[PDB]
Design an enzyme around this catalytic site. Structure first.
Site, short mmCIF file in Angstrom:
data_model
loop_
_atom_site.label_atom_id
_atom_site.label_comp_id
_atom_site.label_asym_id
_atom_site.label_seq_id
_atom_site.Cartn_x
_atom_site.Cartn_y
_atom_site.Cartn_z
N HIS A 352 60.66 14.09 57.22
CA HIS A 352 61.68 14.26 58.26
C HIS A 352 61.06 14.86 59.52
CE1 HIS A 352 65.70 14.38 59.79
NE2 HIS A 352 65.74 15.68 59.91
N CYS A 353 60.24 15.87 59.30
CA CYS A 353 59.57 16.61 60.38
C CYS A 353 58.62 15.71 61.19
CB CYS A 353 58.76 17.77 59.80
SG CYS A 353 59.79 19.25 59.38
N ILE A 354 58.33 14.51 60.69
CA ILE A 354 57.37 13.60 61.37
C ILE A 354 57.99 12.28 61.86
CG2 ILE A 354 55.51 14.43 59.82
CD1 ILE A 354 55.48 11.79 58.45
#
Lengths: 362, 362, 362, 362
Positions: A352-354
């Site tokens: 998600h963070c990427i």
């Protein structure tokens, strides 16, 4: 590709649509710095390559890589058949399109806008992860340029994408242990901050979860503990192991969530995600230049919600296959795919963070 | 730091002194490109770090690293006590100071000059290893600048340092399979080329060994098969295994050497170095971006001759400890040190190919 | 964004459509190097800014600028109202999208392909203008990536866009003084070269003009002397001043053109463009770093043919207003606009040499 | 080239020697960014070239230029005869070696140490001139590396070289309107700050001038209003024009100076420098990219004190020749040279602000 500056999305009639809503494609950067990724980042790259190839079967991917690792990324994406993945040249200090990236908007009439926040590397000179973060603060503006979409600039308001989760209607999920952190808007009151979130997201209500599983890195982002799986229904990590590092924060969150209602009024049908039973043990830490075996976060809540599909992390944990089962329940009419995004979890953040999805239009 | 241009070292009274002669320090670059070094080059870097730390106990080292991996190299060299190793900022397309670097000179009166050759990446657009080689062609000029030493520029004459070995007096050891290669001065005759080598090295005689163990990479450099261990005495690889890949070239060289005399007249007391019994098997070749298990050269003749010491490669071969013994014989009054420079042998070249010593003066 | 490699556009049913045909937008780079542009290139930049703003009123512009001058170009394009001009990040050794750029194709069925040629800086190591040209050889591939268009790669065939002019049907205008130059395919015969031009352009006939007004720079490109203003009708510089530097080449061309027929058979209704009466006198040549008052080419034939408009150069010459009149005749149903692109003429090339249009589709 | 970290120069027996004392050479950077220097910085460069060539006749110069403008600077320094000026490769966000650079020390026994302060671009995220200042914070460490000189790191203490002037013995000249500015050590008291200045400079006394002529840029540095021309005697700008922008600050300073004594006790024989009668009118401000005719500081107090010579600014003002006369009085036994450093005064700072001398040793 201009910048609206005298009005806010609320007045302009725009709203960050739910992550689950229909979307045109997904944006993601490219890991390179040895300061954070081991072994020249080669492993993490392959890990990014897969997580990319995964979105492939659901929608197109916009892979933005620095000029120095361009030829490479293109030779590897063509090496995988090369379907609907395009490699655009873009510089960045680190690959976290989720945060620095643009947070799109929509007027439900076809037009596509966006809100560009201020990025200071999760803290800044006070508690930021790295120092030069000027190239990342460009990523959001740059991506709105090659897409032909205007944007709103929240001057002096530093917020990162993966610190807020929204549901179609006037409601967002923020984590006070982060948005209130002194290294993030210490000139704004909890009152002021809510107003902003209400003007640039169009959320008439803000739910304040209250501690995160990211103590001193992201400073407790919410995209690690919970999210909206559907307007009204949400997700949330939950374990009973009273000796598990995320136990209390997770339960404390679950109790808060379940006792909380949204804007339209419906209660929040809280779900249950599992947590690893064995933390990722960082290996080969020596190849990580400085300006081993230490634990690194590994949350299954770090999944991307594309249309007609789910990209979930698979660290190779005991409660791994269970995660794929659980997520399956939540999104029955959605093919779930899992990738070994454990190699990127060594960088502090997951799938998600990427990524960063762009809502389709017409 | 100017450039003499109307005369040649021969006329100016300068001469490339023997590698063994007294020297002030050693110059070496820093590996970084993923096009050639596996795993982000992290391994090769550590391999360079050691080979550097090794010279430490004999003389100072001038480690030149690109601006992007500077902070890193300095944090690792201080991490090793930090004695007489200085990290100077310098860009390069690849770490091979031996070739692109400056080939110093001396007038035996204190003055220190140099001869800067043309570098085209071992071949150029015709057979070069990589394309953009403009930053490397700068390395030689750049290093002569921060040292306060004039230089001679051999216009249109492309020669690399590790393709020639010299002994104090008018004699040099070149390898025709390289200096004559079409991708290196195909407008110059074997006659012309000798003249140049005689004017910029001050060698009244040029010994032409005739095939090399570098078929299509360096194009058969001589700094892999033999060299001058003392004015008159030389080194040379030699094996009897008639099924060893270097057999014939090595023997063909030995026969040539032993039957050859130098300038002053003395016969060449040829020595014997050993060759590995097992070629280095390249592993993890996947992390090497493209624009496994394949053999890579591993020669013990690739050793650096500092003053009062020897830096020899140790691939972890069967005939390894023998190499250290053999070299010991040659230079009795010289402490011999060995390092696992096998990781750099995967890049095509060893300890010698990655260093460049500067003769001391007064 | 893949690469077709086993067939040619001729077989695949594609053809470079006439420059005049309908087009979606225009691509252009951004000048920066002090090696070629005076005063830090600031003037040339403004000159590019205008020529860009000019295309604005006819179609969208895709301005690609290196990462170092990005923020700048975006602040200047928004400063001009910011209409349909998008700034995409792209590195280049020099701004000449016309040559290094992609030469699009079309199957007349909606699909958009392209042919990527080999670029060696107009000559290469033999006669190229500058050395490192690797970033420019990337521009063509890079631009086809962010556009979702496959491409054909002419391996070992070095050709630049502005060296060939085409008309809808099987005919192209090349200049033998360039395509045959030894620094451009000296392994290919005039026969071989025609075949290529026929396979990647779909031109059943190649007209060979025979000398150019670019003696030693571009090596006599044809996009300086003539072009196709309509399938059958062409343009061409023509002066009677027997003491004008372009006199003979221009007349020699006119005689050739007028006596030449195309593929379909119709005769070439040759037109007449004028030439300056005063050559551009380069000023402030000192601010041009080296690795004044000298004349620089200034041709009015260097105009871009967008749809419903013409962008013509205005050096501030005597026969200037005449040029705008002449071009007006040729394209009556096309608004003609003129810009002071004299500042870029000091770099060797004009408006045409710095743009590249993409044919629209559906 | 290590870092002493458990003791301070005061204890270690080192002290910043007077600028006038004997020195080995001078260090200076190279202007490049269009954000601050007009016309691609070409003018400022030439202005730097001269100010460099000037030091030439007195001692050697160490010109450090970014990798992108290296070949250029070397072609221009050789173009000027090329005497004792060496071009070393070094990256920087802006050319102000005076501030970011190292502040050398000496133990009066031959050893050469240094004190590396923290640099935040004159203010930082609070009031800094530009944002990415990480490459400049490297300059000090980098230059101590290629010189073989250890250094002291003042952690969390941000100070710039040109904000303090020292005389051989325990006394320094700071400007409280700067050192106390909130964007520079707002966690340290005026008491704490003095202690630091006493430990890293070895100054038993700190003279606090109290307003500067740099209101909002450098935040009132003292290297613009006054300095030590000899242990005891000082310099200071002074005008009687009660309508001159520097009038009061200058007089306020003069009154403070004249009424002030140093460490050893002697009174300060205050001198008198003149101020321009016409402020530098910035021209061609358009070529200065943004993320005209406005006045820019032009102080004659911005002079460098090499050994046996003085480099003074000559803006082309009315009270110009007077400045050269005045400075002549102060340093009779010192040849005074003047250069048109007006072009760099458009960048905010002069000759002093762009140099940094290294005290000789033995």
């Amino acid at each position: 590709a201009k910048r609206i500056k005298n009005t806010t999305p609320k007045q302009d009639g725009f709203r960050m649509p739910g992550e689950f809503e229909k979307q045109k494609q997904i944006w993601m950067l490219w890991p390179w710095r040895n300061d954070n990724w081991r072994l020249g980042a080669k492993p993490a790259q392959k890990a990014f390559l897969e997580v990319a190839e995964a979105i492939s079967e659901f929608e197109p991917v916009s892979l933005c890589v620095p000029p120095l690792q361009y030829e490479n990324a293109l030779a590897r994406v063509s090496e995988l058949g090369s379907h609907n993945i395009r490699i655009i040249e873009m510089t960045n200090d680190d690959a976290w399109i989720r945060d620095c990236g643009p947070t799109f908007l929509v007027n439900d009439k076809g037009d596509l806008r966006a809100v560009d926040w201020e990025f200071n590397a999760w803290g800044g000179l006070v508690d930021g992860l790295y120092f030069p973060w000027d190239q990342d603060a460009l990523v959001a503006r740059k991506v709105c340029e090659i897409e032909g979409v205007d944007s709103y600039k929240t001057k002096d308001f530093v917020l990162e994408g993966g610190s807020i989760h929204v549901d179609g209607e006037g409601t967002v999920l923020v984590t006070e242990m982060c948005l209130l952190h002194p290294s993030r808007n210490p000139h704004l009151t909890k009152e002021d901050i809510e107003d902003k979130l209400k003007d640039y997201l169009n959320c008439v209500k803000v739910l304040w979860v209250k501690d995160g599983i990211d103590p001193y890195e992201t400073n407790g982002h919410i995209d690690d503990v919970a999210c909206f799986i559907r307007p009204g229904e949400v997700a949330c990590i939950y374990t009973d192991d009273k000796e598990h590092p995320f136990y209390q924060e997770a339960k404390a969150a679950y109790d808060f969530l379940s006792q909380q209602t949204d804007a339209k009024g419906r209660p929040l049908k809280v779900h249950k995600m599992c947590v690893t039973k064995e933390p990722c043990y960082l290996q080969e830490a020596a190849t990580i230049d400085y300006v081993e075996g230490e634990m690194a976060i590994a949350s299954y809540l770090n999944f991307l919600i594309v249309n007609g599909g789910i990209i979930l992390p698979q660290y190779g944990d005991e409660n791994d296959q269970l995660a794929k089962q659980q997520v399956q329940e939540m999104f029955p009419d959605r093919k779930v795919v899992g990738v070994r995004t454990e190699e990127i979890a060594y960088g502090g953040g997951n799938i998600h963070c990427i990524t960063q999805q762009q809502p389709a239009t017409l």
